[PDB]
């Protein structure tokens, strides 16, 4: 816990260093992780790093901040209902967050929520396509075939499935036709 001292000594390149490290090992409390990383970033900013060395560090923290954004933006009601401590739950993984964003219990779920779930595939780190389907199918169900349409306009493609997805088909092909003209 040297960061506490490294700060009082004005060694902020170093306090940023230990702070960033603790931030990475954090898994017990999301909120703790968040803070430590915010703390890490303040140290970096308030230190004497090179104008590029700095923009290089705040570069890669914007990258982690990009991941904690998903758990950060979990609906308060979804949380209220799974009865989870507003801010005492642990740093979830991408598998876990999709479960939630995809959970049928998440009523107010729209394109954004499923969108979030999709981007989350890239944060899996080693079957990804199955999920990609499960999460896609569940977007149409809420639409009672609007939204599966909107999720596609946002992504603006050969990753999605068609024939195998189906495995009421009237509109599926209709979109799988408007998709043709779109992707081409």
């Amino acid at each position: 816990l040297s960061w506490l001292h490294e700060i009082n000594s004005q060694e902020l390149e170093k306090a940023h260093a230990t702070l960033l490290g603790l931030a990475n090992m954090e898994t017990r409390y999301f909120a703790k992780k968040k803070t430590l990383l915010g703390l890490s970033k303040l140290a970096a900013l308030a230190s004497d790093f090179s104008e590029d060395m700095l923009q290089e560090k705040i570069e890669e923290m914007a990258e982690q901040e990009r991941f904690l954004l998903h758990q950060e933006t979990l609906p308060e009601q979804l949380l209220a209902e799974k009865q989870l401590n507003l801010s005492a739950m642990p740093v979830l993984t991408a598998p876990q967050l999709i479960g939630l964003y995809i959970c049928e219990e998440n009523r107010r779920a729209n394109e954004y929520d499923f969108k979030k779930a999709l981007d989350l595939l890239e944060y899996i780190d080693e079957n990804i396509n199955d999920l990609k389907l499960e999460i896609l199918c569940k977007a149409l169900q809420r639409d009672n075939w609007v939204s599966k349409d909107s999720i596609f306009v946002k992504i603006l493609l050969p990753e999605v499935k068609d024939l195998l997805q189906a495995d009421f088909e009237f509109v599926l092909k209709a979109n799988y036709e408007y998709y043709v003209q779109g992707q081409i």
């Binding site: 700060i7 902020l12 703790k32 803070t35 303040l42 900013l45």
Partner: protein, 225 residues
């Protein structure tokens, strides 16, 4: 001298209801100047001259809104949000020192209230404080300059008021989550802090982790296991 004239004029611009947006705009301009020079009462005096209904008023002259007027309004609300933040801190402070069970009860009410007014300014909805929500407004570099400076002038100050308030009353875990707030990419409050102020902020939060450790909790106020 050149300034006393303008504010003397606010009294005439407030006369005719048909020129209420103009009052609003010209009122904003002055206070932007005052606040730029830390003159909180100077600004508060101009403020009270706006008829406190002047916004519902402007909305009624439309019902058909011009960018410049849409902004004058948001900015007027901003400047209000900002004066309230300071008056409630004054109030809170007074009370933290009066020292005469209805007392503590009123104390928690004040603490909880200034906390909110502070966060109102720091996380001002839909863009942040002194930030236009409308890009289609007519070019005005002086205003744009002034508004950018107020975020540097007044925003960090409230951050420190806020830490105080929290620390002064043992909300030490929240104090450390100011770090979340300032470095948040949502708002980038951090890019209106000088390195001097970021340090000041860091050192204040240390004082807060020492206070947490003092309780058998980790530096961020969490349990050990």
């Amino acid at each position: 001298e050149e300034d006393r004239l303008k504010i003397d004029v606010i009294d005439w611009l407030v006369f005719d209801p048909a020129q209420r947006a103009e009052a609003l705009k010209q009122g904003n301009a002055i206070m932007r100047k005052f606040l730029a020079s830390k003159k909180h009462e100077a600004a508060k005096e101009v403020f009270v001259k706006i008829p406190q209904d002047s916004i519902a008023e402007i909305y009624n002259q439309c019902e058909e809104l011009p960018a410049e007027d849409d902004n004058a309004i948001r900015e007027h609300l901003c400047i209000r949000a900002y004066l309230e933040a300071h008056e409630t801190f004054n109030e809170w402070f007074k009370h933290m020192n009066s020292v005469p069970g209805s007392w503590k009860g009123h104390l928690d009410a004040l603490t909880a209230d200034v906390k909110e007014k502070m966060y109102n300014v720091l996380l001002f909805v839909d863009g942040g404080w002194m930030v236009d929500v409308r890009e289609d407004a007519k070019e005005d570099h002086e205003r744009t300059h002034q508004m950018v400076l107020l975020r540097k002038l007044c925003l960090p100050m409230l951050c420190f008021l806020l830490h105080t308030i929290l620390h002064s009353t043992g909300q030490y875990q929240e104090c450390l989550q100011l770090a979340d707030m300032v470095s948040s990419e949502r708002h980038k409050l951090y890019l209106v802090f000088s390195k001097e102020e970021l340090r000041k902020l860091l050192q204040k939060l240390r004082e807060s982790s020492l206070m947490l450790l003092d309780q058998g909790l980790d530096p961020l106020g969490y349990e050990i296991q």
